[PDB]
Amino acid sequence: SRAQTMSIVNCLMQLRKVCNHPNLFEVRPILTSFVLEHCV
Amino acid sequence: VTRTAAHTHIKGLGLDESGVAKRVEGGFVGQIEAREACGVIVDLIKAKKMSGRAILLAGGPSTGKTALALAISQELGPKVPFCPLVGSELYSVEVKKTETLMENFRRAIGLRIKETKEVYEGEVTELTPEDISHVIVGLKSAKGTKTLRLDPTIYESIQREKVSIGDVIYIEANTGAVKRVGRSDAYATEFDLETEEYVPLPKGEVHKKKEIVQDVTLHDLDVANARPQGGQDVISMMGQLLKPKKTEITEKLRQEVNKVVAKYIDQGVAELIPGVLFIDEVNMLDIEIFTYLNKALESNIAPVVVLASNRGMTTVRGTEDVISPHGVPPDLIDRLLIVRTLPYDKDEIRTIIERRATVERLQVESSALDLLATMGTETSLRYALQLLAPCGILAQTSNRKEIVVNDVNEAKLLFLDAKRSTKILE
Amino acid sequence: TRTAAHTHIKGLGLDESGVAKRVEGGFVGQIEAREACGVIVDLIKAKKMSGRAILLAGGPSTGKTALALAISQELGPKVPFCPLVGSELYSVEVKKTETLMENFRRAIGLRIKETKEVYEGEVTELTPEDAENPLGGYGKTISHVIVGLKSAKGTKTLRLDPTIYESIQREKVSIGDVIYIEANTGAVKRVGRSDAYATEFDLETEEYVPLPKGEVHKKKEIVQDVTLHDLDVANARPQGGQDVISMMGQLLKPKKTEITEKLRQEVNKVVAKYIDQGVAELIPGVLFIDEVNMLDIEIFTYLNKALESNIAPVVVLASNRGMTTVRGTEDVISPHGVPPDLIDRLLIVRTLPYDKDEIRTIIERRATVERLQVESSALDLLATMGTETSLRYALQLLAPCGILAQTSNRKEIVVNDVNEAKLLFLDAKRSTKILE
Amino acid sequence: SLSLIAAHSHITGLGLDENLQPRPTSEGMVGQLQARRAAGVILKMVQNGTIAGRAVLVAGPPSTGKTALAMGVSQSLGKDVPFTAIAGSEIFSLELSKTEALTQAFRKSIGIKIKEETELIEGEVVEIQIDRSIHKQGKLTIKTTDMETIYELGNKMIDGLTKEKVLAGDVISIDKASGKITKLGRSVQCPEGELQKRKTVVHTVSLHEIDVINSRTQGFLALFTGDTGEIRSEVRDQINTKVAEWKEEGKAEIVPGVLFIDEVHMLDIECFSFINRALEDEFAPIVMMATNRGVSKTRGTNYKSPHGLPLDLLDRSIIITTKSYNEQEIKTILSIRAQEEEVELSSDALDLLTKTGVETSLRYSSNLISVAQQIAMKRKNNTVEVEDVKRAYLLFLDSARSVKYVQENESQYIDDQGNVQISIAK
Amino acid sequence: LSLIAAHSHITGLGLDENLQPRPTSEGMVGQLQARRAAGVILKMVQNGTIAGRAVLVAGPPSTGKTALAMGVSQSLGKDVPFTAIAGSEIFSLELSKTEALTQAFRKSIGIKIKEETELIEGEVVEIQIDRSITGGHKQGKLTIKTTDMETIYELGNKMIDGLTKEKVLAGDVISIDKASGKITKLGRSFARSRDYDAMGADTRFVQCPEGELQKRKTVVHTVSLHEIDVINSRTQGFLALFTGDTGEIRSEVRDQINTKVAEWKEEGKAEIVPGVLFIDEVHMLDIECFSFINRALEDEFAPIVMMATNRGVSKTRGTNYKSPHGLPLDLLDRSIIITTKSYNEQEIKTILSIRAQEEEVELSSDALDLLTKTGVETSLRYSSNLISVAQQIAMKRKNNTVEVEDVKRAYLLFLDSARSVKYVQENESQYIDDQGNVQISIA
DNA sequence: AATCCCCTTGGCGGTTAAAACGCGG
Ligand SMILES: Nc1ncnc2c1ncn2[C@@H]1O[C@H](COP(=O)(O)OP(=O)(O)OP(O)(O)=S)[C@@H](O)[C@H]1O
Ligand SMILES: Nc1ncnc2c1ncn2[C@@H]1O[C@H](COP(=O)(O)OP(=O)(O)O)[C@@H](O)[C@H]1O
Ligand SMILES: Nc1ncnc2c1ncn2[C@@H]1O[C@H](COP(=O)(O)OP(=O)(O)O)[C@@H](O)[C@H]1O
Numbered sequence A: 001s002r003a004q005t006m007s008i009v010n011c012l013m014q015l016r017k018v019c020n021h022p023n024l025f026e027v028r029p030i031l032t033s034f035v036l037e038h039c040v
Numbered sequence B: 001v002t003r004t005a006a007h008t009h010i011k012g013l014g015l016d017e018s019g020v021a022k023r024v025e026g027g028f029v030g031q032i033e034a035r036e037a038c039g040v041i042v043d044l045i046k047a048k049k050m051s052g053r054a055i056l057l058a059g060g061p062s063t064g065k066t067a068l069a070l071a072i073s074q075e076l077g078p079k080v081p082f083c084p085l086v087g088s089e090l091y092s093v094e095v096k097k098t099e100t101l102m103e104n105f106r107r108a109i110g111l112r113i114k115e116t117k118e119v120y121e122g123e124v125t126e127l128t129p130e131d132i133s134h135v136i137v138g139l140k141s142a143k144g145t146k147t148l149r150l151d152p153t154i155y156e157s158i159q160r161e162k163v164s165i166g167d168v169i170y171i172e173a174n175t176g177a178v179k180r181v182g183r184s185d186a187y188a189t190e191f192d193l194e195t196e197e198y199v200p201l202p203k204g205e206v207h208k209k210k211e212i213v214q215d216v217t218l219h220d221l222d223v224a225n226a227r228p229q230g231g232q233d234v235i236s237m238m239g240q241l242l243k244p245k246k247t248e249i250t251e252k253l254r255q256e257v258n259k260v261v262a263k264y265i266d267q268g269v270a271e272l273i274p275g276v277l278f279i280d281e282v283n284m285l286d287i288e289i290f291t292y293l294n295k296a297l298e299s300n301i302a303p304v305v306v307l308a309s310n311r312g313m314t315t316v317r318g319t320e321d322v323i324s325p326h327g328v329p330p331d332l333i334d335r336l337l338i339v340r341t342l343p344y345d346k347d348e349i350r351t352i353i354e355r356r357a358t359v360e361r362l363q364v365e366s367s368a369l370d371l372l373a374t375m376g377t378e379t380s381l382r383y384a385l386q387l388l389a390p391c392g393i394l395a396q397t398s399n400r401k402e403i404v405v406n407d408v409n410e411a412k413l414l415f416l417d418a419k420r421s422t423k424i425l426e
Numbered sequence C: 001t002r003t004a005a006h007t008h009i010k011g012l013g014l015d016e017s018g019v020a021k022r023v024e025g026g027f028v029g030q031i032e033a034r035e036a037c038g039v040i041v042d043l044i045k046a047k048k049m050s051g052r053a054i055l056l057a058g059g060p061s062t063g064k065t066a067l068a069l070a071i072s073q074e075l076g077p078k079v080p081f082c083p084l085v086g087s088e089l090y091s092v093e094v095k096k097t098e099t100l101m102e103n104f105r106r107a108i109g110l111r112i113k114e115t116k117e118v119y120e121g122e123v124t125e126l127t128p129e130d131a132e133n134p135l136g137g138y139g140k141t142i143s144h145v146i147v148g149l150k151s152a153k154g155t156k157t158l159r160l161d162p163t164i165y166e167s168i169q170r171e172k173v174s175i176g177d178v179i180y181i182e183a184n185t186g187a188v189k190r191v192g193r194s195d196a197y198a199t200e201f202d203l204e205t206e207e208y209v210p211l212p213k214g215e216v217h218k219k220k221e222i223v224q225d226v227t228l229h230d231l232d233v234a235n236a237r238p239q240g241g242q243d244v245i246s247m248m249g250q251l252l253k254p255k256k257t258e259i260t261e262k263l264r265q266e267v268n269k270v271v272a273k274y275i276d277q278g279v280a281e282l283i284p285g286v287l288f289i290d291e292v293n294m295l296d297i298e299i300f301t302y303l304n305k306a307l308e309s310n311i312a313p314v315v316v317l318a319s320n321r322g323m324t325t326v327r328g329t330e331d332v333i334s335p336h337g338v339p340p341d342l343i344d345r346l347l348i349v350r351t352l353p354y355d356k357d358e359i360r361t362i363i364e365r366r367a368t369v370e371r372l373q374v375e376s377s378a379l380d381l382l383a384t385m386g387t388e389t390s391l392r393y394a395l396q397l398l399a400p401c402g403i404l405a406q407t408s409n410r411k412e413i414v415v416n417d418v419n420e421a422k423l424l425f426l427d428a429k430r431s432t433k434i435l436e
Numbered sequence D: 001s002l003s004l005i006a007a008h009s010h011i012t013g014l015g016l017d018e019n020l021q022p023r024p025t026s027e028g029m030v031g032q033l034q035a036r037r038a039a040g041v042i043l044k045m046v047q048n049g050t051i052a053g054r055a056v057l058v059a060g061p062p063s064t065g066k067t068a069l070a071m072g073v074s075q076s077l078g079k080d081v082p083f084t085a086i087a088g089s090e091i092f093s094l095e096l097s098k099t100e101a102l103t104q105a106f107r108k109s110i111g112i113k114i115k116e117e118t119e120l121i122e123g124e125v126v127e128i129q130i131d132r133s134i135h136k137q138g139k140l141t142i143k144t145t146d147m148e149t150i151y152e153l154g155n156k157m158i159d160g161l162t163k164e165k166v167l168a169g170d171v172i173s174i175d176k177a178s179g180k181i182t183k184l185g186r187s188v189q190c191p192e193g194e195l196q197k198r199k200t201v202v203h204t205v206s207l208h209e210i211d212v213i214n215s216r217t218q219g220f221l222a223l224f225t226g227d228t229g230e231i232r233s234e235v236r237d238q239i240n241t242k243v244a245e246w247k248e249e250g251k252a253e254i255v256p257g258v259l260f261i262d263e264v265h266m267l268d269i270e271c272f273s274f275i276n277r278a279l280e281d282e283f284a285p286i287v288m289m290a291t292n293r294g295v296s297k298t299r300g301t302n303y304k305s306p307h308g309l310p311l312d313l314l315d316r317s318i319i320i321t322t323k324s325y326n327e328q329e330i331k332t333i334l335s336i337r338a339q340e341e342e343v344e345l346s347s348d349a350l351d352l353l354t355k356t357g358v359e360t361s362l363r364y365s366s367n368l369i370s371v372a373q374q375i376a377m378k379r380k381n382n383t384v385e386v387e388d389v390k391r392a393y394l395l396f397l398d399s400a401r402s403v404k405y406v407q408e409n410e411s412q413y414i415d416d417q418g419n420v421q422i423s424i425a426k
Numbered sequence E: 001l002s003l004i005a006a007h008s009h010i011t012g013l014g015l016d017e018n019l020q021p022r023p024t025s026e027g028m029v030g031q032l033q034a035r036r037a038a039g040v041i042l043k044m045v046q047n048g049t050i051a052g053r054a055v056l057v058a059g060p061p062s063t064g065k066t067a068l069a070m071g072v073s074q075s076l077g078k079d080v081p082f083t084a085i086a087g088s089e090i091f092s093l094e095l096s097k098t099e100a101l102t103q104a105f106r107k108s109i110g111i112k113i114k115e116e117t118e119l120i121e122g123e124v125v126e127i128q129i130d131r132s133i134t135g136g137h138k139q140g141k142l143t144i145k146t147t148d149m150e151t152i153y154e155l156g157n158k159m160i161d162g163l164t165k166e167k168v169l170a171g172d173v174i175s176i177d178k179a180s181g182k183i184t185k186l187g188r189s190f191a192r193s194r195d196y197d198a199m200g201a202d203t204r205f206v207q208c209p210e211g212e213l214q215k216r217k218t219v220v221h222t223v224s225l226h227e228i229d230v231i232n233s234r235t236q237g238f239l240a241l242f243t244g245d246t247g248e249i250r251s252e253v254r255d256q257i258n259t260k261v262a263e264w265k266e267e268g269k270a271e272i273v274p275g276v277l278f279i280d281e282v283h284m285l286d287i288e289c290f291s292f293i294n295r296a297l298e299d300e301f302a303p304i305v306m307m308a309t310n311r312g313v314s315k316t317r318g319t320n321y322k323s324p325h326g327l328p329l330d331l332l333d334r335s336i337i338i339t340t341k342s343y344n345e346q347e348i349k350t351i352l353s354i355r356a357q358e359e360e361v362e363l364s365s366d367a368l369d370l371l372t373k374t375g376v377e378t379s380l381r382y383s384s385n386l387i388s389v390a391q392q393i394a395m396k397r398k399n400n401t402v403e404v405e406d407v408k409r410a411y412l413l414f415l416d417s418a419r420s421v422k423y424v425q426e427n428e429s430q431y432i433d434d435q436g437n438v439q440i441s442i443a
Numbered sequence F: 001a002a003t004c005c006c007c008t009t010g011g012c013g014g015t016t017a018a019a020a021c022g023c024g025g
C-alpha cells in the first residue's frame, strides 16, 4: 500500500524481506516491568 | 472456531457522525435514546476534561444495560481503561470496602509512559568476583566484546541461574534481571548427551538500547510504591512473602503518586488516559459504600463511573426505612444523570432473535423464528435467546441443518421457564 | 499556651482537715463530691488496698471528668493514671477481656532502681597482647587488651577482656573516637569523634562530639518508673537477637496477643523478689473509664473477677445515664447502665447540677484562664444563656465572642458580641427547631 | 499538581474581607453569608492556635454548600497547616478498631515543625584524585561562581564518593554532617556563591507520623502501606510528653489543624462516645462535622436524635446552619461552574439552566453543562444554545422524572418483594 | 481409590445415537424427559461453542437430580473438567463470596498445551564414570543398546550426576528425556552377578525395547484456568495451589491471563476445553452470590453452570421475600429449568435391583418385592440403606441370600422418619422441646 | 514531443591499503 504511490525498488526489497521473515523488521518485545525512578 | 457469549454481537453503539443512532447498527436494535446518551457520554470521556462524572443506566431486567456498557467500552477502544465490576465484588475480607472501591477507582485511570530500556546480552567469557561482592563479567557477541561490572544483586541472580563460562545471558540494566538463555552453539558438540539446550551466539552489539511505550494504571504505581513486587534475589522473596495480604493504602501514598505522575506529564514523557468504571447491579452496595462514593466522586482525579440497576422503589441495603428510586440513596442520585432504558416490542424481539441466531451460526426457518419470537414475547426475551442452542442441538441430532417448528416445540417441552416451573410447583 | 477544656482544673482544692473550700483549685461548688474524691485520693496514697472501685454518677456537664482529672493532678505525675473510654476496649486484634487486663496492669507502676558503672572518654591507646606462651590458648590466642581513655579530669588505662576487644572491633573504634563502655553489661558504644581531631580533614563525614565531662569512671544510680504491663510486653515481644528470623520478626507489625496468666505470674514473682530486696517499690495507680455505659455485659462480668485480684488498681467509673438497659442484654434495666452485680462492688459518688451563681463563677474562671476580658453585662447574659441551654454551650461560645470582639478591635467582649455569636452559632435546641 | 476538574475546583477561598464580612461573590463562593461569617470565625480560631478541642457542626439541607464551605475553609487556611478530610465510612476497618482509626485521624491533624540546620557544600566539581594506600589519599576540587579550591578527603568521604561514582563537570551537593550526596546536572543553573553555606531545612510532620515512626523498626513505611496497627498507648504518651518538652525547649513548634468528617451520620455510638472525650484532651484539633438529616436514629442505637448524633456530643458543639439558595444565587453559581468548565453559555441557555435547577436541583443543572457542551460540539457549534440544553434534558433524566417513570411502570421493575413482569405480553 | 457410594452405580446418561433415553442403560432408570434434557446439555458442552449457559434441575427429593449430574459427569469422562461444589462451600473466611465463586467458575475451564519431546530408551551395556578424588572434573561414557542398534554417548556433568543419583547399572532398561533430564528406571534385563546382598530381588525381568533408540513422543499438559491464575498471582502462588490461601487475586491478573490464553488459542499453542460447574443445593447461596452469577455468566471464558434445587417457593437467603425456587427472578430469567418427577413402583424396584447388584447383595424375589413396597411406603433411600444391613443380618445367620425375614429384622432394628416422628410425639416428655424443657426421671 | 545512459537503493560478497600494532634490539 505504501509502495503503490517514494522509490519502488527499495519497496520491492522490503517486500522480499517481508516474505523472508517478519523478524527482519522488528522482533517481538521482551516484556519487563516499568521502573520508577524513586519511591515515595 | 469461535465462541458465543451474551454480548458477542455488540460491536459498538452504531452512532453516525451527527450523533443520531440508526435503528439497527452495531448489533443494537432500538434503544435509540439510550444509545444517543451513551454516545454523548463517550464524547465526554474522550474529551478527557472532567472527573468524577457519574451516570445511571436505569431500566427493567433484560432491557440492554450491560450491553450498553460493553458498547461504550467498545466505542472508547482498548487504549482506555474500562474496569467492569459488580456490587457484590466490593465486599472483600482482606481489606475494607472503601479501600476496594478506591483501588477500582484508580484502576480505571490510565497512564501511558515512555521508557528507555538498556539491555545487555552475549556469551560469557569471564566470571571474576571483585574480591557479597561485585562480579566482573565479559560478554562477547558477533559484532564485539564488552566487559562489565555488576552489582551484588545481579551477582546473586547469576549465581542462582548456574551461569558459567560459555553461557549466554540477558541482563536488563533498568530492572537488574538476569536470564540464562542457554549454552553457546560453539560448544554444542562437546558432549553427545547432556541436558543443556543450546542457543546461537547473539547478533549485534552487546549493549542494546530501545524505547518502548507501556500502558500502566495509577493502581499499578500505588502497588509498586507500596509493596515489593518482583526480583530474583532472596531479599525480594522475603520482602514479598512478608506482609503478603492486601493493605489499606493511605491517602499520602496516593498524593505522592499523583505528584510523580504530574511530574512525568509535565516532562512530556507520559500522557493521561482517564477511563470508565462500570459497576453493575449497584443495588447490592451497602449504605457505607454509597456514602464513600459520594466523597470519592468529588476527587479531582476520578473516572467516569457508570452504574446499572434494575430495581424500583426498593429499600437500600443496610438501612431499614429508606425507600429509594433504584436502591440508590438520594444523596448519590443527585450526583448522577439517569439514562432510562425501555422495554422491547415484538418486532424488535424478533430482530434480536434473528441476529443472535445469525451470530451463533444457526439457521432458523421463518415460521419457527416467528414461534420463537411469540414465545419470547409471552415469557421472556432471554428465555427465547437461550432456547436457540438446544434447538440447534435437536436439529443436528435429526440430521437437519435449519431449525424447524417441531424442534422448537421439543426444546420447549424439555426446558421450562420460571412461570411454568412455578406453576408446576403450585 | 493551648487552653483545653480542663486546663483550669489544678486540683481538688481541699483543706488540711479534708474540708473543701467553696472556690479553690479551679473548682466551683461540688463540695461533697470533692470531699469524697479527696478521701479516695488518700486511700490511693495509702497503697494498701487492691480492687477498690468508685463510680461518679451524675448528669451531663456536672463534673465527672473534672473530678477524675483533679484526682490525677492531686496524685501527681509519679503515680499511674490511665484514662480510658468504654469504646476503646473493643479492639480488633485481641479479645476485649485482654484489653481490659492490659489496661489494669498499665496502672500498677513500679519504681526500679539500678546502679550502673560506665567507662567513657576518648581512646588514646589500643594495644592487644598475646599470651606469654603460644600453647596457652587456641588459634589467635588473644589475651587482654589495654585501652587508654581520656576525660576532662584526666586519663585512665583500662585492662579489658577479649570479649570487650571483639566489641571494640565490631563498633569500629579507632584512636581519637569517644567511646562508652558499660561495666554492667560489657556493651561498647561509639559516641563519635573528638572535637580535637575536628580539623584533621576539611571534608569528612564524622559526628564530632566534645570530650566527656567528669572522670572517666563514673558510677551513677538510675531510677525509672515502669508499669507491670511494660514488663509483660518486654517478655512477650523481646527485642533481643540478631538472626535473620529476629530481624524479620522485628519488621512485622506488633499485633496484640493474649498474654497468658503464666507470664503475669512469673513477672509478679520477679517483682515481688525485687521489692523484698529493696530494689523496687510498688505504686498502685488509678484506672479511669469514662462512659462506662458503652461496656458490654461480658466486660462487666470480667470486671467482677478482675476486681478480686491481689493486684488491681483503683478503677474510677463515670456514667451519665440512669435506668438504662445494659449493652449486650435485652431485659436487664440497671441503675446507671451498670449491672447490679458490679454496682454491689462499687461506691457511688453522686455529683449534683449547678445553679446560676456557680455557672457564672465557672464562666468567669474560664474567661480568665482563656486570657479574655468579659464585661459584667455580657457575662450575666452568658450566665442566663448557660442556665437556659447548657454550661458547655456558653463555655464554648466564649472563644468566638473573643474573636468577634477582636475583629472590631475591642479588648473586651461586649453584649453585642455575644448576641452576634448567638446569631452565627446555634445550639442543639435551636438547630432542632430550625430543622423541624 | 496536575489533575482534572472536580465539583469544588472553583472554590479558592472563603471570600472574606478584613472584618470577616463575606462579600456577595468572592474566591469562588456565592451567598451563604452567615455560614461564611461563622466559618471565618472558625478559621481565625484555627489560625490563633490557642483554642483546642472545639467541634463545629455544619448542618443543613442537601446541595446547600456544606462540603463547599469546608473546602473554602481548607483553601483559606492554606498549606503549612494540617487538614484531614475523611468520610465517616472510612473508620470501619478490618485491621483497626474504630476508636483507633478515630485516634489516628485526630493525630493526623496536629502538625509539628522541626528545624534541622545542616552544613552542605554546593558547587561544580572539577577534578577528583583518589590514590591507593601508601588508608586512602584523596583530593577533590569544587568550583563556584567566585571560588575554586581543593578539599583533602578522608576515608569515609572517599568511600561515599566512590559509591556514588561522581563524574566531573556535574553540580554536586555534599552534606558535612550526614554525608549524603545529591547529584545534579551540568551547570540553566550554576553555583551562586560561597562553597559552604548555612541553610536550615524545616520538616513538617504530624503526631501520627511520629507515632508510626516509633511504632516499629521501620514503621515509616506504614504511613504509605497503611499497616500501622493499633499503636500502644504508652508510645503515644511518650510522643506527647516529648512534644511538650520540645515546645518548651523551643526546638519544635506545633501547628494545630482541622479534622473534617463529611458524613458523621454513619458513625456509631461508640465513635461519638470516643469523640466526646478525645475533644477534651490537649492536642485535640478542631473537628468539623457535616450532616444533613433532620432527625434520625443514631447508628448502633434504637432511638432518634436531633441530628443523628447523641445529645452529649451536640452539647459540646456549636452548629453552623446553611440555607437553601434562590434563583439569582443559582444563576451565578452555574455561571461560575460554566466558567470553570470552559463552557460559553448563552443568556437564554443560562436562564433555562437556572429555572431547571430551581425546579429540580442545582447539581442536576450543574452536570448538564458538560453534556450540553458535548451536544453542541456534535453540531460544530461553539456556544451552547437553548436547544442543546433541551436535548440534554430530554436524553438525561433527573430524580423526580425517573421516580415518576418508575411509579407509572412499577410492574417492569423489581420491587421490594422481588416481583417483576419481564414478559412484555400479559 | 473409591468405595461403593450412593451414585457409584451409574456410568453415564444411557442415551442412543439420537439422544433418545433408553428405558434402562448405564445405571439410570426412567426420567426420560430429564435424561433427554441432560443429553442436550451434554452435547452443548461437547460442542464447546455456547458459553455461560445456566441450567437448573428441580424436583422433589430422591428424584435423581444429583444422579443426573453424576451421569452427565460420567458421559463427559476425563479430559473435560467437572467441578462439583455445594452452596455451603462458598462461605469462606480467607476469601470473599465473589472470589470463591470466581475461583469455582475458573476451575471448570481447562487449557491443554501439547509438546513434542525426544526420549532415549534402551538397555544399558556399559556405564563408566571417571571422577578425580579432590577434584571437580568428571568424565563418563555409556553404551545404551536396542534390539536393532547400539551406540556410545560421552556424557556431560549434569547427565553424569543424574545417572549417579538414579543408581543406574548394566542390567537396567532406562529412559532419558533430553529436555527435562529425568531418568526413569523401567526394569531389569538380568540378574546382578550373584552378590550377597540383594540376592533375588530382580527376578521380574522386562523385555529389551525395540526400534529406534531416540524416538519422538508427544506430551499433553492439562491445567485449569484457575491454576494459571494462582500461579501468576504471586511468586508463592504455586504453593497456594496445594496449601490454599490463594488470597483475592487482583483483577488485572485475570484479565491478562484471559488475553494471553486467547492469544494462545489464536496461535494454536493451547487448546481450551470448557467444562461444567455443578452447585449442590444452590438455595444456600446469598443474593450477592446470585447477582455475581448473573453477571459472570456473560463472560466469554465462562463454563456451563448446573444447579440443583428442591425447595419450591422459599425465602432467598439475604432477603426477606419468597422466590419461586429459592432464587431471584433475575437468575431464573437466564436459566433453563429441567424437571424431575416421582418414581413409579417398577422404577423403584429396578433401582433397588441395580443397587443390590452394585452392593453385591443377592436378593430373593420376595425380599425385593418387600423392599419395593417399603420404599414406596417410606422412601427410596431408606430401602437402599436397608439392603446392606439386610445382607449383614443374613451373614449373621450364615446364609448367602437375603430373605424376607432378614429384611423384616432390618426394618425392626432401623427406623424411618415417620416412625421416629410418631415415637417422639407419643413420648414427647422424654425429649428436649424447643422451649428447653424435658423430664429426665421416670417416676 | 517520443526514447537512451545513468540514476535510483537495499543488502549482499569480494578485495586491496592504511590504522593501529607487540616486539627485537
Ligand atoms: N437492544 C438490544 N439489541 C441487541 N441485543 C440486545 C439488546 N438489548 C439487550 N440485548 C441482548 O440481550 C441480552 C439482555 O441482557 P442485558 O443487555 O445485560 O440486559 P440487562 O439490562 O443487563 O439485564 P440485567 O439488569 O443484567 S438482569 C444480552 O445478551 C444483550 O446482549
Ligand atoms: N465544679 C466545677 N468547677 C468548675 N468547672 C467545672 C466544674 N464542673 C465541671 N466544670 C466544667 O464543665 C465542663 C464539663 O465537665 P465534664 O466533667 O467534662 O462533664 P461531665 O461531668 O458531663 O463529664 C468542663 O469543661 C469543666 O471545666
Ligand atoms: N456557596 C457556594 N458557592 C459556590 N458553589 C457552591 C456553593 N454551595 C454549593 N456550591 C456548589 O454546589 C455543588 C454541591 O455542593 P455540596 O458541597 O455537595 O453541598 P452538600 O454537601 O451540602 O450537598 C458543589 O460542586 C459546589 O461547587
Ligand SMILES: Nc1ncnc2c1ncn2[C@@H]1O[C@H](COP(=O)(O)OP(=O)(O)O)[C@@H](O)[C@H]1O
Pocket: E006, E007, E009, E010, E027, E028, E029, E030, E031, E060, E061, E062, E063, E064, E065, E066, E067, E068, E351, E380, E381
Ligand atoms: N433415574 C435414576 N436412575 C438410577 N438411579 C437413581 C435414579 N434416580 C435416583 N436414583 C438413585 O436414588 C438415589 C437418589 O439420590 P439423589 O439423586 O441425590 O436424590 P435427589 O434427586 O433428591 O438429589 C441415588 O443414590 C441414585 O443412585
Ligand SMILES: [Mg+2]
Pocket: B065, B066, B280, B281, B308
Ligand atoms: Mg446486568
Ligand SMILES: [Mg+2]
Pocket: C064, C065, C066, C290
Ligand atoms: Mg466528661
Ligand SMILES: [Mg+2]
Pocket: D066, D067, D262, D290
Ligand atoms: Mg456534602
Ligand SMILES: [Mg+2]
Pocket: E065, E066, E067, E308
Ligand atoms: Mg441430591
